[PDB]
Structure 1
Amino acid sequence: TRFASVYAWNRKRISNCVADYSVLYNFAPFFAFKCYGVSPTKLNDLCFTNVYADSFVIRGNEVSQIAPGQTGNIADYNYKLPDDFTGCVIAWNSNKLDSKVSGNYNYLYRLFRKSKLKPFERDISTEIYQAGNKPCNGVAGFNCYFPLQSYGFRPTYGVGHQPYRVVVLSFELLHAPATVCGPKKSTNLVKNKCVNFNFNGLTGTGVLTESNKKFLPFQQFGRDIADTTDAVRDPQTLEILDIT
Structure 2
Amino acid sequence: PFGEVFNATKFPSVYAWERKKISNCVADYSVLYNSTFFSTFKCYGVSATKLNVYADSFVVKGDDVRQIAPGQTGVIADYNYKLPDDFMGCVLAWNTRNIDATSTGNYNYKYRYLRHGKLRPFERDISNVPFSPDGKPCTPPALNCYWPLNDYGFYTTTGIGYQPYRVVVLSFE
Matches within 5 A, 1:53-132: 53-131=55-133
| Conserved? CA contact 2:132–2:146, under 8 Å | yes
- d(CA) in 2 for partners of 1:72 and 1:163? 18
Q: How many percent identity over aligned positions?
A: 64
Matches within 5 A, 1:30-45: 30-38=38-46, 40=47, 42=48, 44-45=49-50
In structure 2, what residue type is equivalent to 1:26? N
> Larger % of strand: which?
1
Q: Deviations over 1:59-118 (max 9, x none)?
A: 000111000111120000000000113211011110010001221111000000000001
> Larger % of helix: which?
2
| Conserved? CA contact 2:131–2:137, under 8 Å | no
**Structure 1 stretches of 5 or more lacking a match?**
173-244
TM-score by length of 1: 0.64
Shift of 1:12: 0.6
Given the alignment, which residue of 17, 24, 41 partners 2:25?
17
1:6 aligns with 14
Q: Deviations over 1:107-165 (max 9, x none)?
A: 000000000001100101001111258x4544343111110011011001000100011
In structure 2, what residue type is equivalent to 1:75? A
1:167 aligns with 168
- d(CA) in 2 for partners of 1:112 and 1:74? 10
Closer, same or farther: CA 57–162 of 1 in aligned 2, 3 Å: same
**In the alignment, structure 1 residue 152 sits paired with structure 2 residue 157:** no
1:54 aligned counterpart, secondary structure:
strand
Shift of 1:25: 1.4
Aligned length: 165
TM-score by length of 2: 0.90
Closer, same or farther: CA 96–153 of 1 in aligned 2, 3 Å: same
| Conserved? CA contact 1:132–1:144, under 8 Å | no
**Structure 2 stretches of 5 or more lacking a match?**
1-8
Matches within 5 A, 1:211-226: none
1:212 aligns with none
2:6 aligns with none
Q: Deviations over 1:203-230 (max 9, x none)?
A: xxxxxxxxxxxxxxxxxxxxxxxxxxxx
- d(CA) in 1 for partners of 2:62 and 2:138? 36
- d(CA) in 1 for partners of 2:80 and 2:141? 21
Shift of 1:17: 1.7
In structure 2, what residue type is equivalent to 1:100? T
| Conserved? CA contact 1:7–1:124, under 8 Å | yes
Higher mean C-alpha displacement, 12-21 vs 118-127:
12-21
- d(CA) in 2 for partners of 1:14 and 1:46? 12
1:91 aligned counterpart, secondary structure:
strand
